[PDB]
Amino acid sequence: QQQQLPAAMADTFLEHLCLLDIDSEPVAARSTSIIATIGPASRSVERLKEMIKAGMNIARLNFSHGSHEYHAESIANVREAVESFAGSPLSYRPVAIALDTKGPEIRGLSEQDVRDLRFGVEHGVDIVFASFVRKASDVAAVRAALGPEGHGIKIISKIENHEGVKRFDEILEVSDGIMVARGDLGIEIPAEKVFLAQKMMIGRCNLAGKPVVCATQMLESMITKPRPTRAETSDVANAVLDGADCIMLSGETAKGNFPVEAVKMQHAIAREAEAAVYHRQLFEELRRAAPLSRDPTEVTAIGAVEAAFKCCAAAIIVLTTTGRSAQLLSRYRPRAAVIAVTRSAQAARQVHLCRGVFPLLYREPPEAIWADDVDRRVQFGIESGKLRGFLRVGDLVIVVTGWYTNIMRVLSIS
Amino acid sequence: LTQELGTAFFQQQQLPAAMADTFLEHLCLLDIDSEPVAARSTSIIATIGPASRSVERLKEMIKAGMNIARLNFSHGSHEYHAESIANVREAVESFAGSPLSYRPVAIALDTKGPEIRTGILQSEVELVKGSQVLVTVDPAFRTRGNANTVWVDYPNIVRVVPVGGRIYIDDGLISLVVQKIGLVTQVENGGVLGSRKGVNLPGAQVDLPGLSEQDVRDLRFGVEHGVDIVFASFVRKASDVAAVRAALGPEGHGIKIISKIENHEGVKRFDEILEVSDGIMVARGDLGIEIPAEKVFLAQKMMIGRCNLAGKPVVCATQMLESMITKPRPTRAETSDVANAVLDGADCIMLSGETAKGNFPVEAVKMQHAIAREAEAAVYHRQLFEELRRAAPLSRDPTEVTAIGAVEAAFKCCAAAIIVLTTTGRSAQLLSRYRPRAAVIAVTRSAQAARQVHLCRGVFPLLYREPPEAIWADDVDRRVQFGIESGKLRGFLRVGDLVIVVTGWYTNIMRVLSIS
Amino acid sequence: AFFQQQQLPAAMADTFLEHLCLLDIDSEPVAARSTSIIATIGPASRSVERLKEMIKAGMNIARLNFSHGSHEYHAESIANVREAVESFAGSPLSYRPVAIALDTKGPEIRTGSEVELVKLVTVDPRGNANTVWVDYPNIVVPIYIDDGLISLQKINGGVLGSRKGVNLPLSEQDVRDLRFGVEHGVDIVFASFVRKASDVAAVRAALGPEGHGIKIISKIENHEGVKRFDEILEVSDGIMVARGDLGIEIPAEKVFLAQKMMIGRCNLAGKPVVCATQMLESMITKPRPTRAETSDVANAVLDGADCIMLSGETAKGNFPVEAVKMQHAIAREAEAAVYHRQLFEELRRAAPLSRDPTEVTAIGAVEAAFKCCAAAIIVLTTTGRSAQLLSRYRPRAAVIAVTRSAQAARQVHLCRGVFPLLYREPPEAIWADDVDRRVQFGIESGKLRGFLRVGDLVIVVTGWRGGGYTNIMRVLSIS
């Protein structure tokens, strides 16, 4: 009856389109992360508190412009705004910080980039958006520059030119993820071909189970105007339907006049689009094209996803230290929300890259008997689901842990 | 097969993606180096205005790819449009001197439509947020407009907006929420209010008629001047389009009516509107004011899918390349929007201010032509044909049965074209519905049907001018030959190509034929 | 290497048609044979030493045909089976439970050396070539004899024997026999000529309060049973497609239509279905079957059948042990030939959503096993219900079912894919350890019988506590 459910049960994709209902309200919480770019319009601590409230999950620091001192101020203001919501363990929203490299601008790996990457390690950024990646070797050079101290930082390679599109498979192999950087791409290849690059990369990253970001001009007109155009809302919604894990604001939040409204609008479009995904085809095709595995965590993850669909579970609660188990559930694009309980503050921030994943930083100290410790973390996950809406008593939930994460439990919520 | 067509053949127009066993794998195999060689088949509607009224501009626009010229009767005198129609025909008819290359151009009339308007002020006034404005239909205030009093020319507004309902003013610029009904309201979003501005009542069952007194005059002008198509504004139910069809009357019997779905009621009564219409416009401009902006894409995708399944033309409209009004290159959201209207299933895409008043009308037509051509090739025909078969009602219609056999035949052999002979357009429409990769070359003696089948994706109309042959078999054969030789000249057909020829003795014969 | 066995290339074909083209006679069926075999007891199979040979060859269910034989005869049948079963119990990792099914006489009609009837029926209480006595006085008729082979103004020739079956397109006897079965502990009733739900209720009534645990399999044998099938299935524990009478009651050429329908609807309902009668009929006198007969067995498995049956092949013929060996060899090859990709996918869609945590855990475990080519799903069950919910989604991995209930062990033979293992140790204080020991018994038993191998992966399915659902699924590496 709601969240496009009658369209969910269509027997063909054609008929699923026909059953889309503008009065079927999205009920699930919004699962595609919003990356906002920081600038004069979004730098004060008070503006950042607003943006978070509107739905910003990841803060982008664009190292094309601005001195190390400038970006250090940006990072401090973001942390200040975030911590101002750390009243309670269950109210905390992690916010990730991504550093976007300058690269080879014109107005191998530049000496400026090596300094900026050392700055970002020294300040503990979670993510590097690496500009203009053309081949695997370029990724290797960024990882070397990050050094042993930046070992847990994720590398999202920016595909921006013809070479990088044609070497995509080798680039994705060694990357944590991809950004479809439509800005330079649409100067570097014919403008009319970008949607083809975009759809091919999103599809390949979905198949590989690695996050993919759609970027640049998604709501451009909102730099000067309070409502976006019809092409712009279409573009956000279709990025989500393509498969994107994240969507992005650049000038809209970094310099325009309605940064908070831009975040709200991407949040509003993403939630309508997630409900309009035809999971029936998506799940059969990922199952079918995904190879047999003997990784116990992958095997448990696909089993949990099947069981969640079967009982219309409101949520899968996953216990994870590195994010990996949450990333493997995200890949099968459940409709249930994936609540990832973690003690790793960095993994909590990074799992925003994965669609459908809501990170929960657990703070209580361990329990002597591991099974008690597991149960506390699981109840923590349940409590935050109740608070945040999408767990009613009576719901069934799937729980995923270890005892590798290799256990799946089906639990009805009292 | 390589032996006949080469290796390069099977690398082009996304054929490695076309043959994937899932939609996911079809996406993974799209390739920016696979060139789209088939001719662009989604028609382009361009609105005429000061940027595009000169005869020489219009020829450039025709060469760039414009197929349907849209006259927007929201503005302009009857005189003004008669000179639009005249310059269009003069540009179009300057290519008649070589029939093999002549491109028909349809002329469509987009109505002003039933409207809700504020009055004249006491100039400009400013509605400031928070303040309280009165909304009145007392005739004493038609001319007494102030920043706390607004008159509207729609008496029944007081009955169709409930308490807390919203009222939109000047393209959703200003907004008001009702507080009391005696309508006292509070400015939600404020701004400058001019005079005789447009009003929108999101979610309301407005009882304005299907057309306005000025529409009746405008439609009569259109029939008299021989327009091919009406885009009928603000269609909410079937009685609305029956009223447009009565106004056209007998002189206008064969004008196609494309109903513009602009508001919540129209979306919910879609099935009854599409059934008495020749087709649909997804009018996203007004629809983004009348429903939440973030739900327009749902309405778009629902309406295109339902038209596809019915087999009726569907136009996507409004703000596709908006930034090109001032800049020479579009945004990334804008090229994506055009490509995804085509992938969604649209028959036609449209330009408004990009061609009516902007600095780059020819370039915007070029841009839509280039994207469409790329998006057509990325269509996953495998899944689309199968699903259209798996849902579409078994047919005892001989012309439709022929149509599905010929499209399947064309897919089996990589046919370059389906060549069909039609007099109304109906046989080409039935072919267009199954979305062949092959071009549907429609040879007709009806000048008007040739213009009108531009509404159908995949159809290239050719106007045969020669008088009958005594033997019906030789006139048939002469008309196929005109399509072949037109097709070779335009680059749709090469020696060695296969083609499927569809003709009458209903059009119930298909033939497999080699070119030259 | 591993992808050469078990028809694995066929299993990953993108279409059904291409699955058939990839079937390969050199792909060896390594998985253990999971379709259960029912063997009818008779002079060719009632002795303790024959029963032992049958058990070793694959017999899972011993059928007592109560159309013939005294109560004293059948009680020694039961005792002879139990004695052969329990001679293997000094080796608990290899011990095979064997169930006992009672097949009722029902409303048989029969006639009273031989004679040629050439191309008069009385119920007056001495038959000859022109008179036939029938034990059904009330002929109702405005008539077939002997499995339909003779047909007939006076109340299609051939030889007429004696006491031949008669076809006309709950008795007091039936009631003594059902109560006899409860006294003697039978696991299953095959209830002849079921035509509606009321027929099953009457059986459950004659079974009474001591017999609440007995499963009831309704035999579909005539046109009415076929038409009211949905009603019958709803209230029965399962179905038998009794092709014998059905092929006389409706036209012989329509039986396969009824068989494929009943199997499909039983698969959809997750209830067990048996295919019965003449499957290897020529093996009654021959040491090897016909081409039509090995085909019938294989396609019964392909159709969806949970069990397959022998009657005269094992009750009276000269090669009973060979007939069991041959159903076993065929089912093993057919099981590997099933197209699970389509079957599992259609079972998902057609099947309701469920809130039952056991049903939900079960489908997750079958998805997990398919994803990693699990050799087995090890399930703990006391009633057999968890095992049966695993069996209805038709995994390729063996469902090894560990139970303490000796009756449940026997009764789960009805569910395709389930191997029952009876566990005997008294609990431990801690649920945790009691669980682990029963799992480990399953692993060790499975290693010993050739079901599991170091390096394999298994899915283990149990419950978080003792009174609740079966709602834990664990992926485990064999070591």
Added chain:
Amino acid sequence: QQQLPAAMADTFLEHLCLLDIDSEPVAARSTSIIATIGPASRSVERLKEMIKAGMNIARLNFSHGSHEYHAESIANVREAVESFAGSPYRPVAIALDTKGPEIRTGILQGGPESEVELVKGSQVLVTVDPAFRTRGNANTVWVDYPNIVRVVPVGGRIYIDDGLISLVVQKIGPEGLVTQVENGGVLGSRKGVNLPGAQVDLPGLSEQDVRDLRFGVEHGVDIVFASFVRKASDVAAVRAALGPEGHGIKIISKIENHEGVKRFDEILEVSDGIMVARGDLGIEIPAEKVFLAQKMMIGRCNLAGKPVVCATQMLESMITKPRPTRAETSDVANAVLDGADCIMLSGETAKGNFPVEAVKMQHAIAREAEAAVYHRQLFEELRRAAPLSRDPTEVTAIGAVEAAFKCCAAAIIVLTTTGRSAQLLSRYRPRAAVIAVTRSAQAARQVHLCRGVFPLLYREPPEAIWADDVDRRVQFGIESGKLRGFLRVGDLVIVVTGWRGGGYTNIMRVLSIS
């Protein structure tokens, strides 16, 4: 009716769930029936009853019987067929099934009817030394195939007397093959030998087969069922005995052993079709594996669009009884659902007491089974797998069966001279009866090899103008259709013809019946 609700289901499972013993089949039966001609079916009056019960193809088994005996069978068959001229008239094809190469043991010391017992576990020497040709005993078996000693290796197996005795080679040496009896039994004299999994280098044709194919040609048969085909060069041999044009005869290759199953694709490429020869396959490979071989071969033949025969023991018990077993009706039904174009009877028609009943029974089972095929999925899968084609006749064919499915057409009327046009429709398995109008008497017999093709022989001389001559042949198809129940006023039918005489079959037309 025609199980049409089950036809419409969205899944295969649901299709099964909707089958209905009271949904009566209406369409004409499309799977051909081959009957083997022998003493129970040789008389002209008997063959008449057999044509009426539904025989389409008369098979002659040259494993037994003289040329004079078969000549007489052929004459009676043709006399019975010709008796129905003056026509509603069923063409009947004649197939020659060859004896084939064989391997046999020698004579035992005790002579022809003697027996000796080979005891499990004993040592038995298999020898080709001809001084044992008549001296076989319990420890020594002679065989007429010298190269057995170099084609069966240590570990290999030698089967004797229809698979009943089994020996495992233990040692190879100048005296022959030292075996151990794995399966013992009573051995007689001159018993058939099978070498499971061997590459047997016997030739494609026996001496007897050369004389019989010459007889086949001279008496004008339509079909050869060629025995023991292992490899393409065995087919090339059959074809050379038949000559350069092969006189039009169709070569249906019999797959009977392991080598042929594994070299199936190369055999099919050069054959007109296949017979699944389950009798010998069941000796040559484990009996429980034969359904695998059958399902693969039928599948591959459907893919390729070539005819496949299911053969042997389909209704065995009817040799003595008037009603078959439940496993036999099921076997017939499942060969149809599998996709077999043709089904067969051997002893059931050749020597049993119920030959007309057996034909009747296959007829009744095939009709029911044909209505139960799941055309939605089958058609969809035959489309995806069949490759692109620039052959105009094949392009028209797929266009025509898709049109036929769109409107639930009663029939496709096709004009064909060689049968090819009718075979390209048949490979897409339409529900619509394919009505093939031909002037060629031999193509009318031979299209019986294709499921769903009903031949009509046209005897009228050609009109002066092609378009007239075509319309008359089309009209003949309509009017015969009506008379024989294929179509009726109200139906749609597809009409497949050619634009020119001597060109491609490149036209399709949709017609309402009047």
